[PDB]
């Protein structure tokens, strides 16, 4: 019995009156000095080792790949060589299956750098990191190098859509001549930084085949860049996003889901809110910023139904529907409900 | 064994120009970048600017960019340097050293041979 | 420009002596540093590459350390061919720096 009814805020309170290991889908978070498990937002967080120096692994080829399975978090770096993608007949090194190259889809934060060199032919983009919000740099590759991308000459986009941030480091991106979309991003944004030569990309694909070839940026993207084509494939959107993909509107007068507006990004709303017809749904995603309620109303939230028999912090905690759906308490001399504040419409 | 060999003393005026050579045997000349380094009598060294040998890409320093050439003669295994628009401060010891990297993104541009040293005075 | 700082300018040490010079960028130039020994009136000499590594041919005394900002070359128990002057290079940035150079004199 963790939460308990409360008369002053209308809404449920932790109980003051309420080893083992977590489940694989909940992480053990502690909550003020006492240790409980909290569901993951799909795969839980996982740190693994990294490539390069400081490991035993100088490349990722088929002998380590399998086990960056379920990986969240590299706490090193990523080097792809040549040797570790094509094989090496001399040693009877098999090349690396490229499916294996999907465990990556998982990674959300690189500490050190990325070392790309090599790239199966048929993989137009590093998509593999979709994922991969930010590049740390706190170990960097060559000459301060936290993003190295070399002769990758099958490379259409670059692919990183949910990269946002790189700490620190310089950015190599060059002889990949038939790579686009590259031109118009804003590194500045990305580098937390003034690019002071940090920037060292040349000799890909020029500027004016990509354009006239209308390989460039969706009109849907802003002045930020992006990754490749599509509305996902934008750094910043010009106007909202929904789930990661740049959108003309959110549906604040209508749509499927009704939405509100939070930094640029559209977020459906409670589902205990009646949806607004021309007109706004609701502030934020609680149930007490809501334009007019669903079904109910207990205080501020608007409820499905009102407290009938919730425990409360002097016992059962019971109300009855107003006459406009608004959660009144039932008298106090009656138990097992009521239908309303007399004495005689108890039980 | 690796020998690099320079051109003789020089004596310029201020407002000409001078080039010197940098015969090259005992290694492929192509494969290592040649790096220019210069040093005033009793002063510290000056890096000039490299050029590779076999594209003839060169790489001047922006104090010397504009009035120095640095050409390349594979037939002979020769690198030559040449700096006009000379100046009193220009007075030093032309060295010419060798990358010790046959791959340049990896090398360290460390200076493992070194010619012998050409002396340079201008004065008017 | 990255510019190198030695330390000390001037050393006056005898045959024997473990000596130590300091050179110090003025930015994070990771650990692209060599160290050069320079004999009056001839070429230099390059003793350690990429911050520690010993080129081959020069003695096992010489050693470098330190990455990032602040770099040492140490040599131990001084020889009479290693009083020179000698010379930091950084290669991190396109246009190579060189310290001003420190000079180990004999004691006496």
């Known amino acids: 019995q963790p939460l308990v009814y409360n008369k002053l805020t209308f809404q449920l309170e932790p109980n003051p009156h309420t080893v083992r290991a977590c489940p694989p889908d909940k992480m053990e978070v502690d909550k003020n000095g006492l240790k409980m498990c909290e569901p993951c937002g799909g795969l839980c967080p996982k740190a693994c080792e990294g490539t390069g120096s400081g490991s035993r692994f100088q490349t990722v080829d088929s002998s380590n790949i399998d086990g960056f399975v379920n990986c969240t978090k590299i706490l090193g770096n990523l080097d792809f060589l040549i040797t570790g993608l094509n094989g090496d007949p001399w040693h009877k090194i098999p090349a690396l299956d490229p499916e294996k190259l999907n465990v990556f889809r998982t990674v959300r934060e690189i500490t050190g750098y990325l070392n790309i060199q090599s790239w199966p032919p048929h993989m137009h983009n590093f998509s593999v990191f979709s994922n991969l919000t930010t590049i740390g740099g706190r170990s960097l590759y060559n000459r301060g190098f936290s993003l190295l991308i070399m002769k990758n000459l099958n490379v259409t986009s670059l692919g990183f859509r949910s990269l946002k941030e790189i700490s620190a480091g310089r950015i190599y991106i060059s002889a990949n001549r038939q790579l686009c979309y590259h031109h118009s991003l804003n590194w500045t944004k990305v580098l937390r930084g003034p690019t002071e030569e940090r920037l060292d990309i040349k000799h890909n694909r020029p500027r004016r085949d990509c354009v006239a070839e209308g390989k460039v940026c969706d009109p849907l993207c802003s002045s930020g860049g992006c990754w490749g084509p599509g509305p996902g494939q934008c750094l910043s959107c010009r106007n909202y996003s929904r789930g990661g993909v740049c959108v003309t509107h959110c549906n604040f007068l209508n749509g499927e889901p009704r939405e509100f507006a939070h930094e640029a990004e559209c977020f459906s709303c409670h589902p205990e809110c009646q949806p607004m017809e021309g007109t706004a749904t609701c502030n934020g995603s609680g149930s007490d910023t809501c334009a007019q309620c669903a079904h109910f109303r207990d205080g501020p939230h608007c409820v499905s139904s009102c407290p009938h028999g919730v425990l409360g912090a002097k016992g059962p905690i019971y109300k009855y529907p107003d006459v406009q759906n608004e959660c009144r308490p039932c008298h106090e001399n009656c138990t097992q409900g009521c239908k309303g504040p007399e004495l005689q419409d108890c039980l | 064994q690796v020998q690099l060999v320079q051109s003789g003393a020089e004596v310029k005026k201020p407002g000409a120009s001078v080039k010197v050579s940098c015969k090259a045997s005992?290694?492929?000349?192509?494969?290592?970048?040649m790096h220019w380094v210069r040093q005033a009598p009793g002063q510290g060294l000056e890096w000039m600017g490299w050029i590779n040998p076999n594209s003839g890409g060169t790489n001047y320093a922006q104090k010397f960019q504009g009035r120095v050439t640095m050409t390349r003669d594979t037939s002979i295994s020769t690198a030559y340097m040449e700096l006009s628009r000379l100046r009193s401060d220009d007075t030093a010891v032309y060295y010419c050293?060798?990358?010790?990297?046959?791959?340049?993104?990896?090398?360290?541009?460390?200076?493992?041979?070194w010619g012998q040293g050409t002396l340079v005075t201008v004065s008017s | 420009d990255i510019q190198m700082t030695q330390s000390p300018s001037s050393l006056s040490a005898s045959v024997g002596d473990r000596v130590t010079i300091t050179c110090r960028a003025s930015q994070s130039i990771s650990s692209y540093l060599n160290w050069y020994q320079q004999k009056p009136g001839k070429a230099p000499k390059l003793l350690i590459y990429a911050a520690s590594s010993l080129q081959s041919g020069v003695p096992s005394r010489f050693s470098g350390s330190g990455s990032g900002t602040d770099f040492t070359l140490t040599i131990s128990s001084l020889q009479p061919e290693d009083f020179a002057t000698y010379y930091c290079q950084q290669s991190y940035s396109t246009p190579p720096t060189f310290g001003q150079g420190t000079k180990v004199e004999i004691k006496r």
């Open positions: 005992g290694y492929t000349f192509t494969g290592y970048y």
């Open positions: 050293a060798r990358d010790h990297g046959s791959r340049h993104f990896w090398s360290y541009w460390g200076f493992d041979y």
